[PDB]
RNA sequence: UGCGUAAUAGUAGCAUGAUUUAGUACGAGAGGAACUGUCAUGCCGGAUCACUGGUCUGUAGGUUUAUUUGACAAAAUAGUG
């Protein structure tokens, strides 16, 4: 009876994210959290913007 | 003289809470209203003294200090002792 998305979701930006949607809507939003591996994105974190 | 009018002017009541609605509506939950009804309350005003309190030259009674009038008596003065 279920419909599935396999969309990626950063570990940091979920901080009680799966807990909210589950309670708000049980059955019509049942997030099963399963790790895979760390995706690399084009961005360079560094302290102080120079020039 | 009475009984009246009423131009002109002034003019007064305002504000809350509890409950009823309703743990309702609303909201995934967290929470959480209103119209309406009732009982009250804050300040504002206009009166009144039945109660309660206040006051006392009612110099109304009661008590007592000092002095005076021989004593008791019953009074006086002490600016209402």
SS3 readout for chain A: CCCCCCCCCCCCCCCCCHHHHHHHCCCCCCCCCCCCCCCCCCCCCCCCCCC
Q: How many residues does chain A have?
A: 51
Q: A20 beta carbon < 7 A from strand B?
A: yes
User: Considering only CA atoms, which of A8, A7, A30 is closest in space to residue A18?
Assistant: A30
Are the beta carbons of A30 and A19 closer than 8 angstroms? no
Method used to solve the structure: cryo-EM
Long-range contact pairs involving A29-33 (C-beta distance under 8 Å, separation at least 24): A30/A2
Are the beta carbons of A39 and A8 closer than 8 angstroms? yes
Q: Distance between alpha carbon A5 and the CA centroid of its chain, in Å?
A: 12
**Nearest nucleotide by C1' position to the A23 CA atom:** B28
Interatomic CA distance for residues A36 and A7, integer angstroms: 12
CA A1 to C1' B26 (Å) is: 33
Residue where the block lists tokens 């790790």? A35
CA A16 to C1' B39 (Å) is: 49
Cβ-based contacts (< 7 Å) between A 21-40 and strand B: 23-24
Are the beta carbons of A31 and A18 closer than 8 angstroms? yes
Structure resolution in Å? 4.1
């Amino acid at each position: 009876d279920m419909f599935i998305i396999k969309a990626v979701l950063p570990v940091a930006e979920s901080f009680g994210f799966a807990d909210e949607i589950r309670k708000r809507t049980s059955g019509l939003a049942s997030p099963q959290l399963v790790f895979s591996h760390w995706e690399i994105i084009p961005s360079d974190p560094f302290w102080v913007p120079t020039t």
